[PDB]
Design a protein around this ligand. Structure first.
Ligand SMILES: Cc1cc2nc3c(=O)[nH]c(=O)nc-3n(C[C@H](O)[C@H](O)[C@H](O)COP(=O)(O)O)c2cc1C
Ligand SMILES: Cc1cc2nc3c(=O)[nH]c(=O)nc-3n(C[C@H](O)[C@H](O)[C@H](O)COP(=O)(O)O)c2cc1C
Ligand SMILES: Cc1cc2nc3c(=O)[nH]c(=O)nc-3n(C[C@H](O)[C@H](O)[C@H](O)COP(=O)(O)O)c2cc1C
Ligand SMILES: Cc1cc2nc3c(=O)[nH]c(=O)nc-3n(C[C@H](O)[C@H](O)[C@H](O)COP(=O)(O)O)c2cc1C
Ligand SMILES: Cc1cc2nc3c(=O)[nH]c(=O)nc-3n(C[C@H](O)[C@H](O)[C@H](O)COP(=O)(O)O)c2cc1C
Ligand SMILES: Cc1cc2nc3c(=O)[nH]c(=O)nc-3n(C[C@H](O)[C@H](O)[C@H](O)COP(=O)(O)O)c2cc1C
Ligand SMILES: Cc1cc2nc3c(=O)[nH]c(=O)nc-3n(C[C@H](O)[C@H](O)[C@H](O)COP(=O)(O)O)c2cc1C
Ligand SMILES: Cc1cc2nc3c(=O)[nH]c(=O)nc-3n(C[C@H](O)[C@H](O)[C@H](O)COP(=O)(O)O)c2cc1C
Ligand SMILES: Cc1cc2nc3c(=O)[nH]c(=O)nc-3n(C[C@H](O)[C@H](O)[C@H](O)COP(=O)(O)O)c2cc1C
Ligand SMILES: Cc1cc2nc3c(=O)[nH]c(=O)nc-3n(C[C@H](O)[C@H](O)[C@H](O)COP(=O)(O)O)c2cc1C
Lengths: 141, 141, 142, 141, 143, 140, 141, 140, 140, 141
């Protein structure tokens, strides 16, 4: 039924540590590679913003799995639509931490695509979330 | 906030699904969706569920997260999630439409109009086809 | 003289607003707006105000700055201000529509049509949703 | 949360406006705008102000309502207020540009480029001209 | 021959304009415009003229140069001049519409519809607003 | 009511002299700077092709004065419309004479934007006159 | 072949054209155009011809090449030649409409609607005006 | 992969019989109903013009089978694309014979959508074939 | 009525000689220069493909004279429409012989804009002919 | 009737050999050159994906011949439409084998234009097949 892209956000569980983030990256890369899924996970200011690209069914099944994870709560879908080609091609999953990135670059990128004084993905539109993640992916290459 | 959205998803009915089960689903959704500002429509046929929800980005997502935990269906597949200027499915907090209790010639034309399948197969339908199929049902009701 | 414009804004009615308040707002609004070439419509429901004003860029702005000084409401939020080819809200210099003095079902369906909320919440509505909500009310009030 | 918006307004500076008065304005705007997630640009020339603010619909409104109470100007005119997909005035929570301290030729050409007036007259300019005028100022900083 | 065009302009009527003045204008516009393949409509109201002319690029220009020389009005403003695929104002070489001989409420709402002004002020209206205002006048008073 | 552009053409009156041109350019520069008007005047093959940018009322009044000038006759308006920004920014008024340019570059420019073997602005559309003038202005 | 096309051209009647000439033109046109799959419409008025032919790119061209050798007119000028998705002038292999036998006011308004002229002057008309002019004449028959 | 529509044309083999047409119609109706396929068959002037809607795979497989039928030759694909909704809903396969309908209606229809003096789908674009088949279908 | 472009094709008459080609080019340069006409004539595979830009009347009359020339036959109009600017500016008439150019540049060009295994303008659309001719002109 | 493009896919019959491919390329190179046909053949993961550009009739007949070939089975048409210009100009027929290429560029190219974890033209849209083929043609010059 074709290639799709999903974008959703969520609130991280309190006290998340680096080993927790690395654990997410490690399982996501293996499962996604198996499932034909690509994407990117953005972490900052206690919030997750993720995009997954792939088959309509596979991406749905992965999202239903991600909802069971106790490392986050209060998930919101931002968008689900058919896409002509992938944007997030290179990584089965890439984690980007806004805190390990140039303070100035991120502030300008977060301002560019958002009205918020901090990283607040609930205040961004679907196209803003996409373009935010696209620039993170393009610089994190 | 963030605005009005519509979700469209499909799923498989669990084997043994009973009319009571159908009525229990409708009873709880109507109370919940009314509380949440959610309207929409549930189509059941050929062992398949095809549903749409309209409302707040967060609320619809939370309702979908709850629906994913229901054992009365399995293998849910998201069809689309996007922002909308206005609602189509205004009249009912949640309306159940059974394809089997309907004019066989009306439903045959409808299912053919918006799908390539010889029976009702939402998995073979695009997001636009599911929207238009459901809308004709809503209008016919 | 920069053409015809439309402003849309919303606000919270102040606690204790009474029918005399609504009449005073309408009485001054009709006189000022007729003087200023301003037309529009004010919607009241669920403790919220939703209003649109059409006219000259300077006049409408001046009318809005006066409105922000009015103690009969608070927490104003601008929804949209843009140039327009033609007016939609032609007939009245100002018209009050109370959502509660109307067919509950017609309004319930309209409030659902153009918003995600279980109640009248103009802060949850877009500029296009506010305009189309207001236009349908205007078309029914004729 | 109804998304990112841009406000543009103009006003007349009250007589006697002083250099310390402008610096005070710039000092409070940077603090307030940074607090509120707001960015923008203030233009001063020919006794007139032309400013733009980007950010949240509610915050920008509340900021305009505060600016309207300031005795250092009068006769404000809204030029446009609308939703935007991305910010243009990303770099400064607030920046002052004095047209009088700029190349008489660079500013004269820019003033003619975007208005029919022989002097700076933002009231004679469309929303698009004010935007494009302020943007070139922004790009020259 | 560069095709069909439309001109829209406005002006202030000179003080003391009389009904015979409007009649001399109308009798002469009809004869000249019929000769020159020009059609159009003149609106008079609130001491202001708002007129449109359709025809050949050169003919319309010359008629405007003639109109500019007339002492019966002053302070003309061009609102628009462009090529058009087809005429809107076809039925009359020139038709005069006086806003005062028409339904106040009909004209009132029409003037608000296409302008920000509390009275008829073509100087506050765009080319498109002027076009649409004149077109509704032309359509309603087909007589 | 915003920034507008006018383009018109005309026939020069027989006996046009440089002094004649000197008076035109001198009063135009003064008058246009006062009025917020910019533009360009093209002369060639006995024809004027002009563009003026500025306020709707000002540009019109200037056109009315230009129509009284006896140094030319048979004006035609080419277009009058609103514009987002000026193209002809640099000069309150600039004269360009086609005859004092490469017999090759202008031949082309003209042929590019007209069906005629000589400069015949009555044969050009509004968009052809604009682009033709924009190319001339862009050269200086 | 290479598709359905429409040609529109105009010409001046050779001075002294007679009714029998027009008859003979119409009789050859119906026979030839019917043989060649060509349809169209010929307007005559004020000493001018305005005609359109629809059909094969080759057939219409050759027929036009034959019309060019006819001494009953001169000064032919092509108005338009392009590919078309469907015919407008379907009903007749060739139909003659004389502007001289029509409601004097109907023809006056039609000529004014699609021309800057006080007389029928097809040389003063664009390709779209000729098309719309002939189409209205066709619809009144 | 979704709903598609195919259009193809061919020459009927010499000797085509009404019984021949009926075997085609009967086997097509059964197979297409099995295959979720709908469509329309046009026959005139010795030519076939057909459209099928359904699954990309299914429609292709049916076309491959049509290519082996000896009752026609010189098949030519006209169009194959994804479609949002079916136009040819009502019948799995419906035969419309051009030659036995109103002579004037089919003359106008065939002229409307083609440069030819007889039915010649080889002279028609994809859109012409589609709009032609659709007007036939709408008349049934 | 402004600037137009014509595109047409024809078959060269049997026996066409280089002097014949040189005379066509010679009279075309004079007539077109007088008539304000520019364009390009492409000769290949025994076929002519030409385009002319200029005034609507002049271009037509020139086409009518071209139709009486016995050095070619079977003319087909490809397209005739209004244009905003000339593409074939530099030359009142220029010959491009496909045979005197790189077989590979021309082979690739001919495939890009046609379904044919050789140069066959009768198989090309108006847009394909224009773009074909424009690439020749730009590389010329 | 102009230039067209066909795209189709099929399953290679079991046991396909290098000689098998050489014979396919050999006749296709000859036949397409005779027919004015250009195109490209992609082989990978036991699947064929091909495009042919040329005349509507010739391309159709070449497809009819290809369907009789027993070296593949289960052919599926992807798209057939008229085109303004060719994309695959340089070759009458060129074979590209995905396994004789860099796992990365092919893997990422294949992910770019499909949801699948391996090459599966059956899950690809018409526009994805075209773009997949076009990047292959562009790389192998
Ligand atoms: C924010 C977040 C994003 C995640 N994204 C993915 C993902 O994209 N793919 C994935 O396989 N698991 C993802 N996970 C982890 C799953 O929730 C879960 O732990 C994982 O799929 C375990 O899979 P298993 O049950 O098959 O072993 C994510 C978890 C979090 C908290
Ligand atoms: C096909 C299907 C559709 C459902 N749709 C909705 C719905 O629209 N809204 C809702 O509140 N529950 C819906 N449910 C039910 C949820 O799974 C769950 O039973 C419900 O939210 C229970 O709410 P509770 O928190 O009051 O127990 C649906 C269940 C199924 C099987
Ligand atoms: C919700 C609301 C809407 C209002 N709308 C208008 C209006 O459209 N026009 C107006 O003149 N005043 C309006 N007002 C009132 C103004 O704030 C102010 O009281 C009024 O202009 C005072 O007029 P005056 O000082 O000239 O007598 C509104 C007030 C409220 C609370
Ligand atoms: C032209 C002008 C522009 C201003 N722009 C801003 C601004 O962008 N943000 C802001 O907070 N204040 C701005 N101000 C200042 C406000 O009028 C006011 O002094 C400030 O919002 C006070 O905030 P407070 O309640 O924290 O004292 C501006 C004042 C002027 C005269
Ligand atoms: C508002 C106004 C509109 C006019 N419109 C026209 C017109 O459409 N056609 C026309 O010939 N004269 C029109 N005139 C009159 C001309 O100024 C002038 O008197 C007239 O063309 C004299 O024509 P004649 O000298 O060629 O006889 C108009 C005058 C006014 C004041
Ligand atoms: C072709 C041509 C173009 C002209 N353009 C302008 C112009 O752009 N601005 C201007 O003020 N005068 C222009 N003029 C001259 C005016 O017609 C008139 O002589 C001048 O405005 C008178 O200036 P004054 O009113 O100060 O005496 C032009 C004259 C000609 C012949
Ligand atoms: C204005 C005009 C329009 C004509 N239109 C057609 C036409 O549409 N079809 C046609 O066959 N002949 C038309 N003709 C006639 C041709 O010039 C020619 O005389 C006729 O095609 C001769 O037929 P033939 O092939 O038997 O010699 C027209 C002639 C004139 C003067
Ligand atoms: C013009 C024409 C159209 C046909 N269309 C169809 C068709 O739409 N569906 C179909 O199943 N067979 C169609 N056929 C018949 C096939 O060629 C073949 O006989 C049929 O699929 C046999 O099916 P079988 O597997 O049951 O033997 C058509 C034949 C012709 C000549
Ligand atoms: C393929 C071809 C193209 C021609 N192109 C032109 C042309 O562009 N301009 C032109 O004047 N003659 C052109 N001609 C020649 C005319 O047919 C005729 O010979 C020429 O115009 C001389 O006529 P004249 O001396 O009466 O002017 C062309 C001839 C052929 C065969
Ligand atoms: C995947 C695949 C692609 C093929 N592509 C072509 C092709 O593009 N052109 C062609 O002539 N044959 C192609 N063939 C081969 C034909 O099936 C047949 O072998 C060939 O056309 C020889 O025809 P002929 O010997 O009758 O002349 C292809 C075969 C396969 C398996």
């Amino acid at each position: 039924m074709g290639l799709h892209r999903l974008i959703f956000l969520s609130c991280a569980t309190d006290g998340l540590s680096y080993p927790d983030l690395r654990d997410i990256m490690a399982k996501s890369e293996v499962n996604n590679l198996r499932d034909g899924i690509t994407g990117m996970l953005c972490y900052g200011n206690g919030m997750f913003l993720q995009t997954l690209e792939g088959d309509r069914q596979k991406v749905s099944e992965t999202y239903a799995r991600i909802l069971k994870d106790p490392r986050h709560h209060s998930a919101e879908i931002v968008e689900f639509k058919a896409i002509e080609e992938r944007t997030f091609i290179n990584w089965s999953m890439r984690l980007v931490q806004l805190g390990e990135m140039d303070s100035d670059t991120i502030r300008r990128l977060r301002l560019k695509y958002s009205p918020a004084a901090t990283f607040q993905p609930r205040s961004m539109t679907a196209e803003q979330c996409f373009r935010f993640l696209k620039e993170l992916y393009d610089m994190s290459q």
